Design a protein around this ligand. Structure first.
Ligand code: MH5
Length: 291
């Protein structure tokens, strides 16, 4: 799958909030463009003169992540984070010259991302009480991946000693996105586990943190909540469910061609980190069928 690469796969079935450290530093920001940040300002001004109701918003930037030696005690992951914006995204990753900026970054900084906003996304593998994952159909009128299948998530907005607060807002924001889009009560959801980080090679390498969340409702009760909001309660245009049994081979189905890259990352990491049984009991051939 050329349109998604794994930057990180978490150990132990995924990491809770308490085993993650963040470092939020202006050293983790995008570098100023070789010819000045004027190019981003020009693209923004042009866009507002066609859509004057658009507004900017701050975003987190992923610079890098380091995993501890496996089986160790203490914090297991460090996230190195800066700040970016929707405006900087439109002028870099979403720019037609995005591939030229990646080449210039390799040359100048030995880093394909050095000149890119790279806003951090979040997505969820959301499992029901009756063992399904939750999918959403994207509107055909949106800018990115129109009409494709997605999972719940989005792009959290800011606001280890400021670090711990940053880690809490990331985990809080995946739950809030599930409540806003799927119309579920907060109290039907587990604390999320981080499965890993996935890069969207169709959006110049920007990264999404991918999480596992369990709901205490069945698929049928999840569907009821989603629909009972009506058309204005959600950006998506439909909800559907796949048994966890059948998620194992999803990359061999006709659905795979309709999944947006960030939802591909969520399913690949769910299959590696929550599936793939390591032990003699869940490993047995009747429970884990060959081929
Ligand atoms: C900071 C974000 C990363 C990706 C986002 C999704 N929305 C989007 C994508 C591509 C163009 C546009 C537009 O408004 O042109 C919107 S939001």
């Amino acid at each position: 799958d050329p349109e998604v690469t794994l930057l990180l796969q978490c150990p132990g079935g995924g990491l809770p909030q308490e085993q993650i450290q963040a470092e939020l530093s202006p050293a983790h920001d995008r570098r100023p463009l070789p010819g000045g940040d004027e190019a981003i300002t020009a693209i923004w001004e042009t866009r507002l003169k066609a859509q004057p109701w658009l507004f900017d918003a701050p975003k987190f930037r992923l610079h890098s992540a380091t995993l501890a030696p496996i089986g160790s005690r203490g914090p297991q992951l460090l996230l190195r984070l800066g700040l970016t914006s929707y405006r900087d995204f439109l002028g870099t990753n979403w720019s037609s010259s995005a591939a030229w900026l990646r080449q210039q970054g390799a040359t100048d900084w030995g880093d394909t991302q050095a000149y890119l906003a790279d806003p951090l996304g979040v997505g969820a593998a959301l499992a029901t009480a009756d063992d399904f994952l939750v999918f959403l159909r994207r509107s055909r009128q949106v800018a990115e991946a129109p009409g494709l299948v997605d999972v719940p998530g989005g792009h959290p907005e800011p606001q280890d000693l400021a670090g711990q607060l940053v880690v809490h807002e990331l985990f809080s924001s995946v739950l809030q996105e599930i409540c806003d889009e799927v119309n579920l009560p907060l109290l039907t959801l587990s604390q999320p586990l981080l499965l890993g980080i996935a890069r969207n090679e169709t959006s110049a390498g920007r990264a999404s943190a991918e999480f596992y969340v369990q709901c205490s409702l069945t698929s049928e009760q999840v569907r009821k909540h989603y629909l009972s909001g009506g058309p204005e309660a959600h950006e998506s245009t439909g909800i559907f469910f796949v048994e966890t049994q059948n998620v194992r081979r999803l990359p061999e189905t006709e659905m795979w061609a309709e999944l947006c890259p960030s939802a591909k990352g969520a399913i690949i990491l769910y299959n590696r980190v929550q599936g793939s049984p390591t032990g003699a009991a869940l490993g047995s051939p009747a429970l884990l069928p060959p081929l």
